Amino acid sequence: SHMITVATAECFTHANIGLTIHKAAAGYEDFEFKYLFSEEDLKLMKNVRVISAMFVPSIIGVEKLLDIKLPEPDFNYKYAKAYSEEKDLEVAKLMAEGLKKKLNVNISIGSTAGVGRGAICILTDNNRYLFTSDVYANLITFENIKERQKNGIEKGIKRFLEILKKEYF
Amino acid sequence: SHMITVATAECFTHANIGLTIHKAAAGYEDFEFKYLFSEEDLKLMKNVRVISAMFVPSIIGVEKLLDIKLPEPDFNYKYAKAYSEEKDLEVAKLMAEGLKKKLNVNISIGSTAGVGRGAICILTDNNRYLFTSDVYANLITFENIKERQKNGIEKGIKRFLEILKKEYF
Ligand SMILES: Cc1c(O)nc(CC(=O)O)c(C)c1OP(=O)(O)OC[C@H]1O[C@@H](n2cnc3c(=O)[nH]c(N)nc32)[C@H](O)[C@@H]1O
Ligand SMILES: Cc1c(O)nc(CC(=O)S)c(C)c1OP(=O)(O)OC[C@H]1O[C@@H](n2cnc3c(=O)[nH]c(N)nc32)[C@H](O)[C@@H]1O
């Protein structure tokens, strides 16, 4: 017997998907994305616990923490280390999978966004859900970065809850 | 040759010390704790890079991510767990040393608060700094949690800038 455990390794989303899931689970009355959760969602959230929520903007950093090897970035300059959308998808997956092996949680989440719509991977005991944000942006030129970040957090949380209710309840 | 690298493993401060250092280093024009940074600090900040800021509210979680062993909690109700001051201070220091060993960063930060004033350790290449927050709170009764969290963030960042200046500049 245990709780439904979750951990996250996030880049463009700033650990906000895992921080939000934690505040919801911990019964906070106020938090930025609380409007995403119904009354019933918040009840179910009482059964959830965040084990870690990590902001990981370093390739070497996350490789050392999660024992994983990431692909070479498509843009490799230092006001511009960035993956294309295809490798962002691959990276969100390798991080989710590495976290799940590191921490043995029920649900792990990876997020990364370079050039394109970015990538979130939610991996559970049952299935893997991989998706982009709805917002094209460009880390190297700074176009639409803010809007992509916000949409990534909202979509990641929205999908997390659908998945949680589907598989665990 | 290298930048000044920083990593953090934060519990009560919610990874906000690391996220705030990152936003400053990244030249964000505003962000919640910007008022702690002088215009000269902000210039110095461009030579700093955050490798990871992690929120780690699980003992097993931080033990697995940092490869350390933590002391038994002083209050352990399975779902609720807290240290008092002496073990909080030990644990901040264990996390900071663990982070420095794992990631080889110049500056590592650990934070944890159970019952009492909580504990922040800032570990550099040259020195170790260990201090409590200024606010007594109690995880178990919930008294003064919010006030201690904000004070821990402000005091960590303030002491961080002082140390960065004194040692790296
Ligand atoms: C704020 C805080 C703390 O003081 N100590 C620790 C342990 C450590 O640092 O060693 C953690 C993890 C922490 O962060 P957390 O968000 O877990 O707050 C701890 C608990 O404190 C309660 N709590 C915190 N903020 C709120 C809030 O806004 N509303 C409610 N209802 N409970 C809250 C919740 O039960 C929550 O589980
Ligand atoms: C937003 C974002 C993103 O789209 N992609 C990545 C790589 C990962 O996915 S991790 C990351 C790490 C990411 O987070 P950040 O490093 O906080 O933001 C990327 C860059 O966008 C810039 N930026 C974001 N907000 C501001 C801002 O408010 N002011 C300025 N001057 N720059 C900003 C800043 O230069 C920052 O380095």
From Swiss-Prot, chains A, B:
Source organism, top-level taxon: Archaea
One Pfam family it belongs to: HcgF
Signal peptide (from-to): none
InterPro entries noted in UniProt: HcgF
NCBIfam families for the chain: PRK00962.1
Sequence similarity: Belongs to the UPF0254 family.
Entry protein name: UPF0254 protein MJ1251
